[PDB]
Design a protein around this ligand. Structure first.
Ligand SMILES: CCCCCCCCCCCCO[C@@H]1O[C@H](CO[C@H]2O[C@H](CO)[C@H](O)[C@H](O)[C@H]2O)[C@@H](O)[C@H](O)[C@H]1O
Length: 453
């Protein structure tokens, strides 16, 4: 079985990994708009362009990771490089409050696009380690929950005690407190990197002797291996749909909690219950995946946020606000997202296995590049579709609109995520085949095939 040591070390690695990007994801807009003083249009355009650039960069990083040959491995060197460079670029990212004028703008833009690329560097090869740690069904099912739980916990501890830190350390200067807390983030991040590098021992890697990998591959060949691997392209589409839906819902939540307070002091309780639900469902996944089916857990992952959307739709109809319904929708969404992420990591591992099985090529970096680029492109496409719907409904001026227009806009914003969720689950139940007998066939084929020359 997987070493408990390796399980917990991968967990801590994921914790430090997502403890460095939680601050960014959650408060970089607040820093740039409330500490630096930059127009919201600039920040939005930069964020969108940077997410597009990162999505395009992802496959390039996958090609790089597969082609690299080195002593530590083909993942660990890039993991280390990315961790260190991203820590540095993060510190620079939050040191933007120093400059002013065009200098400040250029600094912000450069540091942001860097931070993005740098995080890609290590994000792809990091998650590329689960397929090489093991290729068994239950072993993966009880391996992935550890890093997913630790990542969620990092995000939630950020959400919780990121502001108190910045307040206690130089309360007058918010930028100083930000760049100081960045030091705590960097310390945890580098410690976790060292832990995972020392303890995680890739077993079925693409750079070992018996694997079916080919380090000398072109960018065209690799990126086309996504379409040739029908299951990987199916996962691409499914994850894209789910990410677009989750992004639209999370944006609705941010707009309904920030602009409209919803109710003073509601967000702490909502976040507490959401984190509790997410962490619990991640803890009890190793038992749920067996009590229920993997297919049924995916169905639930896509249906629970749909039930949340329906609840808050019924709410929007009459009840402008019901704290109970709010936190219930939050709990449902969080359970769905936890299930989705765990199953998605396990499934990208299964897809690299199936690619070795069909195309006779083992390439984990490309599957996880697909994962990361889909994460970025989910936000990208959610923004695109929201702008499209706003222009269609007549919100393109953004100066003054009808109350009925706003109500219809809310209704459309609630309905579209449901469309994307039903898309992801129909695609799953109509195209995906890597469950049950198929998985064991692939596993046995690979194991028996691992009998070197
Ligand atoms: C606090 C407010 C309520 C709860 C959270 C908001 C609702 C989720 C809406 C987007 C779901 C896409 O997924 C998330 O994406 C983030 C980036 O990191 C993710 O994406 C990266 C890829 O760029 C890395 O893989 C990283 O490990 C992975 O967690 C992580 O912060 C989250 O935890 C992870 O759920």
């Amino acid at each position: 079985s997987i070493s408990m040591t390796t399980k917990l070390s991968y967990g801590f690695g994921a914790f430090g990994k997502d403890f460095a990007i939680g601050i960014v994801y959650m408060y970089l807009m607040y820093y740039y708009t409330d500490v630096v003083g930059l127009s919201v249009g600039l920040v939005g355009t930069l964020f969108l362009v940077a997410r597009i650039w990162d999505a395009i960069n992802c496959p390039i990083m996958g090609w790089i990771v597969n082609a690299t040959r080195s002593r530590w491995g083909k993942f660990k060197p890039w993991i280390l490089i990315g961790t260190l460079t991203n820590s540095l670029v993060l510190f620079l990212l939050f040191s933007a409050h120093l400059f002013e004028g065009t200098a400040q703008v250029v600094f912000v833009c450069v540091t942001y696009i860097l931070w993005g690329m740098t995080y890609t560097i290590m994000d792809i090869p990091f998650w590329s380690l689960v397929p090489t740690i093991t290729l068994d069904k239950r072993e993966r099912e009880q391996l992935v929950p550890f890093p997913r739980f630790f990542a969620s916990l990092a995000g939630f501890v950020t959400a919780g005690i990121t502001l108190p830190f910045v307040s206690y350390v130089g309360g007058a200067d918010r930028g100083f407190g930000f760049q100081m807390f960045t030091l705590v983030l960097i310390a945890f991040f580098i410690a976790s990197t060292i832990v995972t590098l020392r303890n995680v021992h890739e077993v079925y890697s693409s750079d070992n002797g018996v694997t079916a990998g080919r380090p000398h591959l072109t960018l065209k060949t690799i990126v086309g291996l996504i379409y040739k691997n029908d299951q990987l392209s199916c996962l691409l589409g499914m994850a894209l749909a789910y990410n677009i839906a989750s992004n639209i819902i999370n944006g609705f939540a941010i707009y309904y909690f920030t602009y409209v307070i919803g109710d003073a002091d509601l967000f702490p309780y909502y976040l507490s219950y959401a984190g509790a639900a997410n962490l619990l469902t991640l803890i009890v996944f190793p038992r749920l995946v067996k009590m229920l089916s993997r297919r049924i857990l995916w169905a639930g992952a896509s249906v629970m946020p749909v039930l949340s959307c329906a609840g808050l739709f019924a709410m929007a109809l009459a009840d402008i606000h019901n704290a109970a319904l709010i936190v219930a929708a939050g709990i449902f969404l969080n359970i769905g997202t936890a299930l989705f992420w765990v199953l998605q990591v396990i499934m990208v591992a299964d897809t690299v296995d199936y690619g070795e099985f069909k195309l006779n090529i083992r390439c984990e970096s490309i599957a996880y590049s697909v994962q990361t680029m889909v994460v970025k492109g989910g936000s990208a496409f959610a923004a695109f579709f929201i702008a499209l719907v706003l222009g269609l409904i007549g919100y393109t001026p953004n100066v003054a609109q009808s109350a009925q227009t706003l109500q219809g806009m809310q209704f459309i914003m609630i309905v579209l995520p449901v469309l994307f969720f039903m898309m992801t689950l129909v695609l799953y139940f109509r195209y995906y085949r890597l469950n049950g007998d198929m998985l064991r066939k692939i596993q046995i084929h690979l194991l028996d095939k691992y009998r070197k020359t």
